Amino acid sequence: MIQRTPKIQVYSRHPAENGKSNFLNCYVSGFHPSDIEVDLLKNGERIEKVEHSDLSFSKDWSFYLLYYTEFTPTEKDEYACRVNHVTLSQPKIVKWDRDM
Amino acid sequence: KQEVTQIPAALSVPEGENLVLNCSFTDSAIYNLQWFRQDPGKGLTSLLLIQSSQREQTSGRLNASLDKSSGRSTLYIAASQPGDSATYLCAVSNFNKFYFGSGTKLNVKPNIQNPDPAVYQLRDSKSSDKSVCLFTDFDSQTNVSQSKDSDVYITDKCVLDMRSMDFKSNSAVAWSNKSDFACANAFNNSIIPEDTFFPSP
Amino acid sequence: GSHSMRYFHTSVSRPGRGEPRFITVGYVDDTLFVRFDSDAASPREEPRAPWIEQEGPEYWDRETQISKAKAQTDREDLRTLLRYYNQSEAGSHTLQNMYGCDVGPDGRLLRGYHQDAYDGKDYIALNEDLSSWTAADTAAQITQRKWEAARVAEQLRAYLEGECVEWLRRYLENGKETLQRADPPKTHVTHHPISDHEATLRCWALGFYPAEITLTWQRDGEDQTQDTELVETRPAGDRTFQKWAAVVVPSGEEQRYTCHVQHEGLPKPLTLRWEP
Amino acid sequence: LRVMMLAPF
Amino acid sequence: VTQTPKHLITATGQRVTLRCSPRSGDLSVYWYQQSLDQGLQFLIQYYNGEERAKGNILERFSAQQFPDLHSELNLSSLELGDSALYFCASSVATYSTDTQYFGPGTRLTVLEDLKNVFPPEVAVFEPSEAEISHTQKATLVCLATGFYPDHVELSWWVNGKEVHSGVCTDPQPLKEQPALNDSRYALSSRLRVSATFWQNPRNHFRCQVQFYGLSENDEWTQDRAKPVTQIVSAEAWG
Ligand SMILES: *[C@@H]1O[C@H](CO)[C@@H](O)[C@H](O)[C@H]1NC(C)=O
Ligand SMILES: *[C@@H]1O[C@H](CO)[C@@H](O)[C@H](O)[C@H]1NC(C)=O
Ligand SMILES: *[C@@H]1O[C@H](CO)[C@@H](O)[C@H](O)[C@H]1NC(C)=O
């Protein structure tokens, strides 16, 4: 019935320090229905062991999911989050910004 | 594993007395707990349904508790009436199926205002070869005892309600096929009130 | 001060792809502690917090047997709602349910919850008196009359007034070190020039629990709530949360903008500025 | 603790 | 909730069929077996035509719920232990917050052979004049003797109409010789009326005993008469 487009946020668990291990998170929320595809990208290619949280929702019945992976950030390496939903014309990518 | 036990097995109490019927169960993960009364004929009739998280339920003179942690339920009957006489079953609903208890039989003894005990020899029927002796109008405190001989058969006590006259009366029956049968010596073993009218012929 | 226990349920049917998927989670405040996924090998209720692992095996058997019964009931309800709404059996539909209780500092019930949703829209919910229902349409009124006849509200009222508050207080004592102690945020202000005449100031709040926080920018004592870009509070991944707010500031006048953050773990509301 | 109740639609 | 049949006398190795009709609007049916050694035991539950819950039901017990929400129960290759009370229950649905409604119950007795089945002989006993003079009320006693098994329903009938006030009946039938050999049963009952009503000679008293035994369908090779399901009565006048 109702269909909502997801809000995407890609960020790190800890402040970015090149050379030290951290966690890269892709928080998706506000979408409906629950069928969604989320892959974490490194240099354009997918990360193979990405873990996700259990499906939950909010007061307005919109779902939210957290896709996270342990990683070690560097200056050159570029990370992104690919999200695919029925409300999208094509898969959407949100690049990781160290200041956002 | 669920095992429901009910104590006591039987219960005979004077009318007006408050009762405490206990029920224990070993599996606490239950959906509810019910109390049924079983009368011969109609069958099981539900009295109280205590919800899974409810700790008490009430309906008139019935007041039942529930503690799932201990695994215990208790039905309190207030001001016992003769109509309450029946068997009371403790039921419990689990994930897989329903479990019932052993049961508690209840006999609410009424009160006879004037004990007028008397043993009467009713007329023998032309069809029958036996003569009947009737112990009637005795108090509800007398413990009727069975016969010593196997040729004389004694029934258990029983009450009748003459609602038109608002009268209640106990009654016991004995019979035998041997001609050496005397109603004065029929209830020989049973302790008989010495004020019993023996209308010796 | 206020604490809550919540249980969420989601069922999405997959016609042709197998059985409907059922996922349920439990929260004490903003901390996940139990979960159950129908698409696992031998699905069982698993723990997700350290203070819940202290429960005996009988506890886990009950919670698993409750989540597996809820998944069976949702399969019946999903097929029932197809009859109510004349929907097709080849379409994927979503059933959602949430119930929970709120308690204050006294340790007694403040507010009870129980509500269902079909395809993202409200279906039937338990009123705050824990004794009546509000149906969204005439199809939910069919369920409402059945739930009133079966006295469903009386069991929920007993649960929400009883075991929900009692077992939440039990969880708050077993996890007293993490649930009853709040983590204040770590604040700082960054500067990002946009143009020669325009720049942006970003006020950060990192590593705070619970998720409730308020970030407000102020122009010389007046809020720039219209010109402030705020983002949804996001989970950091270690049971803490992050939030930031930004303002478009004319270059040169950065010292006329102040960030004000309020959180339970903070002794007094904070005032922070861009330090060069 | 979860609630033990079956209430179909 | 209605059940059929009411009573059921049979031998070992035979097959019976129990049917149940739930309350209108109820979608769930439950079957129970009440035996002396195991008490009330849950057999199986059907809900809206499909099997939902199952207890320790034997493989030789077959049940089914029809699209009209009625239920059937087939007990095959009967044994002595199958002698029990079989109840049927119904509920609106599968709500854990709602109750069940039980039916009257079907009583099944399984014997080794139908040779020891005997109907009762009944005889009323008119009141004593000593009691009439001492209590101003008259008690009638009705003795039923020499029947096996204990599938008897006793009732009093005054002037062609059944009466329930002032009537007492024994709760359980008494065995004549309590011993190993399957002895026949006895049953007494009392009816108390006004002494003036007993004096009036135009009123009629009738003790009726409904005995359930063999059906005409069953075979009978013994020399004595068939102990068919019959009614034995005895009368008295004022
Ligand atoms: C029933 O329980 C009460 C307390 O709950 C106890 O005092 C009483 O003795 C019990 N009845 C028995 C054991 O027959
Ligand atoms: C039921 O009995 C308990 C104790 O036996 C008592 O505390 C409670 O007040 C009773 N409930 C009612 C409604 O009488
Ligand atoms: C029970 O037996 C009857 C008669 O043979 C048959 O019609 C019916 O289908 C049987 N039902 C089951 C469940 O076996």
Cross-chain CB nearest to D7 (options C63, C150, C164): C150
Q: Strand, coil or helix: what is C70?
A: helix
CA distances B75 to B37, B59, B198, Å, are 12, 11, 44
Region label for B186, one of left (φ > 0), alpha (ψ between -120 and 50) or beta (otherwise): alpha
Q: How far apart are CA C12 and CA C78, in angstroms?
A: 9
Nearest beta carbon to residue C155 from set B52, B55, B95: B52
- Does residue C95 share a domain with residue C191? no
Torsion sign, CA atoms B48, B51, B52, B57 = negative
Q: Which of C156, C180, C204 is the last residue of a domain?
A: C180
CB contact at 8 A, C76 and C86: no
| Alpha carbons C179 and E65: distance in angstroms, whole number | 52
Spell out the residues 6+ positions from residue B60 whose beta carbon is closer than 8 angstroms to its own: none
Say yes or no: C140 and C155 in one domain.
Answer: yes
Q: Which domain holds residue A56?
A: 1-100
Number of independent structural domains in chain A? 1
Which residues from D are below 8 Å from C7, CB to CB? 2
**Cα–Cα distance, E36 to E85 (Å, whole number):** 9
3-state secondary structure A19-64: CCCEEEEEEEEEEECCCEEEEEEECCEECCCCEECCCEECCCCCEE
Q: Does B54 touch chain C (CB under 8 A)?
A: yes
Cα–Cα distance between C111 and E204 in angstroms, integer? 70
User: From the CB coordinates, do chains A and C have 3 or more pairs under 8 Å?
Assistant: yes
Using a CB–CB cut-off of 8 Å, the residues of B that contact D are: 29-31, 52-53
Expressed in angstroms and rounded, the spacing between residue E38 Cα and the centre of ligand 1 is 24
Question: Does E93 reach chain D within 8 Å, measured CB to CB?
Answer: yes
Distance B23 CA to ligand 1 centre (A): 9
CA distance C106 to C126: 24
Closest CA to E126 of C252, B124, B52, C81: B124
Q: Using alpha carbons only, what angle is made at residue E215 by residues E213 and E216, rounded to the nearest 5 degrees?
A: 140
> Vertex C42, ends C39 and C46: CA angle to 5°?
80
Mark whether C66 and C197 lie in a shared domain: no
For residue B105, give both structure tokens.
């039989």
C154: contact with E, CB 8 A cutoff: yes
Burial class (CB in 10 A: 0-12, 13-18, 19+), E125: buried
- Across chain B, the runs of DSSP E, i.e. the strands, are 4-7, 10-14, 19-25, 32-39, 43-51, 56-59, 62-67, 72-77, 87-93, 98-100, 104-109, 118-122, 131-136, 152-154, 158-162, 167-176
> How far apart, in whole angstroms, are the C-alpha atoms of residue C272 and residue B19?
72
Q: How many CB pairs under 8 A join B and C?
A: 25
Domain termination residue (choose one: C180, C211, C231) = C180
Q: Which residue bears the tokens 């005409």? A: E216
Structure tokens given for D9: 């639609």
> Do C236 and C207 meet the contact criterion of CB atoms below 8 Å apart?
yes
Choose the closest CB to E128 out of B42, B45, B122. B122
Cα four-point dihedral sign E53, E59, E60, E64: positive
- DSSP percent split of chain A into helix, strand, coil, nearest 5: 0, 50, 50
E165 shares contact with chain D (CB less than 8 Å): no
- Torsion angle, CA of E48/E52/E58/E63, rounded to 10 degrees? 10
Residues C25, C158, single domain; the answer is: yes
Long-range contacts of E100-103 (CB under 8 A, 24+ apart): E100/B46, E100/E30, E101/B46, E101/E1, E101/E23, E101/E26, E102/B36, E102/B43, E102/B44, E102/B45, E102/E1, E102/E32, E103/B43, E103/E1, E103/E2, E103/E3, E103/E20
CA-nearest of E230, E206, E195, E40 to E117 is E230
The domain that holds C23 is classified in CATH as 3.30.500.10
C88 and C156, same domain (yes or no): yes
- The residues spanned by each domain of chain E are 1-112, 113-238
Q: What are φ and ψ of residue E89, in 5° steps? A: -125, 155
The tokens of C102 are what? Answer: 């709120």
* Residue E197 parent element (H or E): helix E195-199
Tell me which H or E stretch contains E141: strand E137-147
Residue C84 belongs to domain spanning: 3-180
Which residues touch E217 (CB under 8 Å, ≥6 apart)? Answer: none
Report yes or no: B30 and B126 within 8 Å, Cβ to Cβ: no
Read off the tokens for C193. 């020039």
Q: In this structure, are C137 and C76 located in the same domain? A: yes
Q: Do C98 and C146 fall within a single domain?
A: yes
Supply the DSSP symbol for C264: T
B29 Cβ closer than 6 Å to some ligand 1 atom: no
Count: domains in chain C: 2
State phi, psi for B24 to the nearest 5 degrees: -125, 145
Residues ≥6 apart with Cβ < 8 Å to C166: none
Residues contacting ligand 2 via CB (< 6 Å):
B 58, 63, 76
Contact between residue B120 and residue B102 where contact means Cβ atoms under 8 Å apart: no
Burial class (CB in 10 A: 0-12, 13-18, 19+), E213: buried
C-beta atoms surrounding B25 within 10 Å: 23
Structure tokens given for A20: 């030290």
**Which residues have C-beta within 8 Å of that of residue E155, sequence separation ≥ 6?**
E162, E207, E208, E209, E210
B21 CA to centre of ligand 1 in angstroms:
8
* A54 contacts C32? CB cut-off 8 A: yes
Nearest-by-Cβ selection for E92 from C149, C154, C155: C149
Q: Are both C26 and C96 inside the same structural domain?
A: yes
Which residues of D fall below an 8 Å CB-CB distance to B? 3-6
With a CB cutoff of 8 Å and minimum separation 6, the contacts of E179 are none
CA distance B32 to chain D (A): 9
The approach used to solve this structure was X-ray
Distance CA C154, CA C148 (A): 9
In 3-state terms, what secondary structure has residue C160?
A: helix
**Domain boundary residue, one of C180, C198, C213:** C180
Q: Which is it for strands B104-109 and B10-14: parallel, antiparallel or unpaired? A: parallel
Helix C152-161 and helix C138-149: axis angle, to 10°? Answer: 80
Q: Which two tokens stand for residue C1?
A: 């001060």
| CB contact at 8 A, A7 and C232 | yes
Q: Give C77's contacts in chain D (Cβ within 8 Å).
A: 8-9
Q: Work out the burial of residue C9: count CB atoms within 10 Å of its CB; fewer than 13 is exposed, 13-18 middle, 19 or more buried.
A: buried
User: After which residues does chain D show a gap where C to N exceeds 2.5 Å?
Assistant: none
| DSSP assignment string, E19-69 | EEE--TT--EEEEEEEETTTEEEEEEEEETTEEEEE-S--TTEEEEE-TTS
Nearest to B52, CA basis, from D9, C130, C147, E96: E96
Do C196 and C121 fall within a single domain?
no
What residues are paired with E75 via a beta bridge?
E16, E61
Amino acid making up residue E106: T
Tell me, yes or no, if C147 comes closer than 8 A to chain B by beta carbon: no
- Shortest CA gap C73–chain E (Å): 10
**Helical H runs in chain C?**
57-85, 138-149, 152-161, 163-174, 176-179
Find the E73 Cα to ligand 3 centroid distance in Å. Answer: 8
- Find tokens 């109490």 and name the residue: B13
Q: Identify residue A53 by its one-letter amino acid code.
A: S
The Cα–Cα gap between A13 and C236 comes to 5
Q: Whose CA is nearest to atom 1 of ligand 3?
A: E74
Return d(Cα C257, Cα C223) in angstroms, integer. Answer: 9
What are the Cα distances from residue E92, in Å, to C131, E22, E100, E101?
Answer: 21, 10, 8, 9
Distance CA B170, CA B139 (A): 7
Chains linked to B by 3 or more Cβ pairs within 8 Å? C, D, E
Positive/negative CA dihedral, C167, C171, C176, C181: negative
Q: CA torsion B11→B14→B19→B25, rounded to 10°?
A: 10
- For residue E51, report the distance from its CA to the centre of ligand 2, in Å: 40
Give the distance (Å) from ligand 1 centre to CA of residue B22: 6
List pocket residues of ligand 3, CB cut-off 6 Å: E 17, 62-64, 72, 74
With H, G, I as helix, E, B as strand and everything else as coil, classify residue B151: coil
Asked whether C113 and C170 are in contact (CB, 8 A), the reply is no
For E:105-124, CB contacts with B below 8 A are 105, 121, 123-124
- Chain A contacts of C232, Cβ < 8 Å? 7, 9, 27, 29-30
Distance from first CA to last CA of chain A, Å, rounded?
33
Amino acid at D9: F
Amino acid at C156: L
Which strand (E) or helix (H) includes residue E11? strand E7-11
- Nearest atom in ligand 1 to the alpha carbon of residue B8 is 14
Q: Which two tokens stand for residue E65?
A: 């719920």
Tally Cβ neighbours within 10 Å of residue C17: 9
> Between chain C and chain B, are at least 3 CB pairs below 8 A?
yes
User: Across the interface, do B30 and D5 touch by the CB < 8 Å criterion?
Assistant: no
> Looking at residue C228, what DSSP letter applies?
E
Domain co-membership, C115 together with C165: yes
Same domain, C133 and C149: yes
Looking at residue C182, the DSSP 8-state letter turns out to be: P
